[PDB]
Ligand binder design. Structure first.
Ligand SMILES: CC(C)=CCC/C(C)=C/CC/C(C)=C/CC/C(C)=C/CC/C(C)=C/CSP(=O)(O)OP(=O)(O)O
Ligand SMILES: [Mg+2]
Ligand SMILES: [Mg+2]
Ligand SMILES: [Mg+2]
Ligand code: NA
Length: 344
């Protein structure tokens, strides 16, 4: 295990007023499709509180829509602990790829069926239709492509897992945004909150840098809190290999990269907001709420704090920082993502 440092976030906490209602609609959905093998698994899935992190990211969205997108994450966690990050398929790329393309296919078209399907695939069809059916054509095109990118990203993790190797810090920062599916998270934010970027904004290299920098630092925050659970491919382990230091010595380096990427995100945000349309301002607002959502929910969620729902927490929130850890405005030397700083 390791000791985490306090976190810097300059945005106020936000939660959807009708959170209690959103979670019940999700619990009803979980029980309807039986997203568990016994009551213990049901308890553990509910303890993730996936409804919360979405409600904290979507404080002004209709609760029916927050609940619909929350199912994606509930299903996510259920299939994550079963298939993606544990089990025999999680360490064989030739077994993972045939399985994972079927889930990517069902995301694109729920009417696509196969002879053998993994548990909770019926739930994947339902949440897909529930999320995408009322959405715009553009939002659906975004849902499909971002989902495939996530499933393709998780395959890349299994490759390194199969070989028992840790990827380079350059390769990790490039691919981590895909493995965490933050592009898909942003797409569900648009669908639920009822915003959609223009083709112009989405393609523009400033907004791409904004999304990728945001995506990366959001998932580095995940790595820090989820490090303990994953032991009981992480920014701590990747830095530990590359610098040949211990996990504890890789903490300040992680926070340095975290602060340098979030520092760039705020710079890009400040440049875009003045000229931003109602759709881009809504995403930026969504990105702000997500920052607080991950920290406020993450260190109160049993997933990253408890070994079982009911046991005392092994992790507590490390606290709030007034200043950033690293104020260096220079670009990171990792050439897969160094181009971000060119859009300032
Ligand atoms: C709340 C946010 C945006 C980030 C915090 C970390 C989160 C939960 C990111 C997910 C945001 C979503 C819903 C992207 C949509 C595609 C789906 C359904 C991913 C489900 C698998 C998953 C949880 C990928 C996250 S990376 P990892 O496996 O290391 O997560 P943990 O083991 O620590 O839980
Ligand atoms: Mg995982
Ligand atoms: Mg993973
Ligand atoms: Mg994690
Ligand atoms: Na049991």
């Amino acid at each position: 295990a390791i000791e985490l440092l306090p976190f810097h976030c300059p945005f106020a906490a936000a939660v959807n007023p009708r959170l209690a209602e959103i979670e019940k609609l999700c619990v009803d959905w979980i029980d309807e499709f039986r997203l568990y093998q016994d009551d213990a698994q049901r308890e553990r899935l509910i303890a993730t509180k996936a409804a919360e992190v979405y409600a904290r990211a979507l404080p002004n969205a209709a609760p029916e829509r927050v609940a619909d997108v929350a199912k994606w994450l509930y299903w996510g966690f259920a299939t994550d602990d079963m298939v993606y990050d544990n089990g025999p398929v999680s360490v064989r790329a030739a077994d993972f790829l045939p399985l994972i393309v079927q889930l990517a296919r069902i995301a694109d078209e729920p009417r696509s069926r196969f002879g053998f399907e993994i548990p909770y695939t019926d739930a994947l069809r339902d949440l897909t239709v529930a999320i995408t059916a009322p959405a715009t054509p553009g939002q659906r095109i975004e849902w499909r492509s971002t989902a495939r990118a996530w499933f393709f990203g998780m395959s890349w993790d299994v490759a390194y897992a199969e070989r028992g190797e840790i990827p380079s810090l350059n390769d990790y920062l490039m691919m981590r945004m895909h493995t965490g599916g933050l592009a898909s998270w942003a797409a569900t934010l648009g669908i639920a909150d009822g915003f959609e970027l223009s083709a112009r904004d989405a393609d523009s290299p400033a907004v791409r840098a904004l999304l990728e920098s945001w995506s990366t630092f959001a998932l580095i925050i995940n790595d820090l809190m989820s490090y303990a659970k994953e032991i009981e491919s992480n920014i701590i382990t990747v830095i530990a290999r590359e610098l040949s230091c211990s996990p504890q010595e890789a903490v300040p380096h992680a926070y340095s990269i975290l602060d340098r990427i979030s520092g760039l995100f705020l710079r890009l945000r400040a440049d875009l907001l003045p000229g931003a349309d109602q759709n881009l301002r809504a995403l930026i607002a969504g990105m702000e709420h997500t920052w607080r959502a991950i920290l406020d929910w993450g260190f109160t969620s049993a997933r990253y704090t408890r070994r079982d729902p009911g046991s005392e927490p092994y992790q507590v929130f490390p606290g709030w920082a007034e200043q950033p850890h690293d104020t260096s405005p220079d670009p990171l030397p990792y050439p897969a993502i160094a181009w971000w700083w060119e859009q300032v």
